[PDB]
């Protein structure tokens with residue numbers, strides 16, 4: 001059961017007469033679905049991603065400044081000028097400088113001065129944005145039958161099934177092996193706000209940073225840096241990384257305002273990360289809405305022999321899961337497929353079985369089946385698996 | 397001469413290509429592709445099963 005691997009979980013319960021359950025599935029959540037006379041199911045939103053989402057605006061984090069050129073004129077001669085002022089990839093400022101005799105100039109007054117600095121971006125100091133397309137984004141929903149098999153989070157359940165929901169994907173049927181069929185219809189517009197969302201990406205090779213951040217579209221367009229679109233040759237607003245020092249005769253002081261990477265990372269502290277599996281850009285938060293069809297699921301092995309009540313041992317003793325459920329695993333020593341004789345008793349009242357199983361009709365197979373999950377009332381209880389027993393105290 | 401037609405009516409229908417689909421008491425609604433198609437008449441009902 002995948003939803004034991006997570007400390008966020010939900011439990012959904014249908015009666016014997018149920019069909020088409022409606023869910024919100026969230027990234028890093030998981031839902032266990034239960035219905036009377038049906039096998040229970042773990043259903044989760046595995047991922048939301050796109051292959052190669054469209055590059056939007058690039059920003060420059062650190063300017064590389066060069067070719068500072070100055071021209072200046074005496075107070076009568078009007079504007080000083082440079083061809084730079086008209087070239088691509090330059091920053092310029094025009095100002096008034098005090099002039100006089102000995103400033104190698106005819107008259108005491110203010111002379112026009114112009115300075116221009118050539119201003120490319122520093123190597124690998126780009127913050128690129130990407131935008132999702134509702135016509136190419138994939139939601140992934142995963143399902144597993146809630147069998148008596150325990151498999152770790154670094155391991156895969158053989159009954160695990162996967163459905164991709166693109167916009168071109170209609171109501172999809174997954175054959176849960178011997179457990180029948182489940183059907184899913186997840187509406188890709190009944191999910192994340194893809195217009196409001198940018199995947200912000202820096203250097204992918206940065207060993208001590210996130211691969212990307214999930215950032216708001218308006219905030220990204222409000223980043224106060226030089227910027228350009230994909231394939232554009234030169235930075236808009238290159239001024240934002242250059243300061244000019246107050247004019248001195250025939251000088252105005254070009255200052256590179258330094259690397260703004262740490263300014264960005266402070267404004268990205270605690271912000272949701274996004275993973276980048278090569279070409280796949282993954283959200284790590286967000287959700288989808290689905291209808292799940294239970295109406296073609298089957299109970300496995302309801303016609304199997306009850307197991308020999310003597311032949312059980314624990315593999316894993318009754319344990320609190322943190323979800324108010326108790327989990328355990330048993331071995332069985334007959335060479336058989338059989339129904340596990342599981343029950344639990346409120347201590348001192350042996351007649352009323354109080355085991356609400358989460359694994360319905362628990363069964364041991366020729367390989368697999370020993371794991372059981374159940375819910376119990378507060379106070380002292382005894383769990384039984386035939387002749388095995390374990391006194392269990394239930395909190396709250 | 398040849399006054400403008402209004403509505404045609406049919407006095408005698410012709411029925412062909414009848415199809416039935418049924419589903420057991422909790423497997424949800426039975427369906428046919430013919431419930432979408434033009435020129436079909438359909439009924440949806442409950443059967444004691």
Ligand SMILES: *[C@@H]1O[C@H](CO)[C@@H](O)[C@H](O)[C@H]1NC(C)=O
Nearest residue numbers: 150151152153154155156157
């Ligand atoms: C999962 O991790 C455990 C502990 O390191 C290891 O024994 C087991 O083989 C791993 N399973 C897989 C399939 O990687």
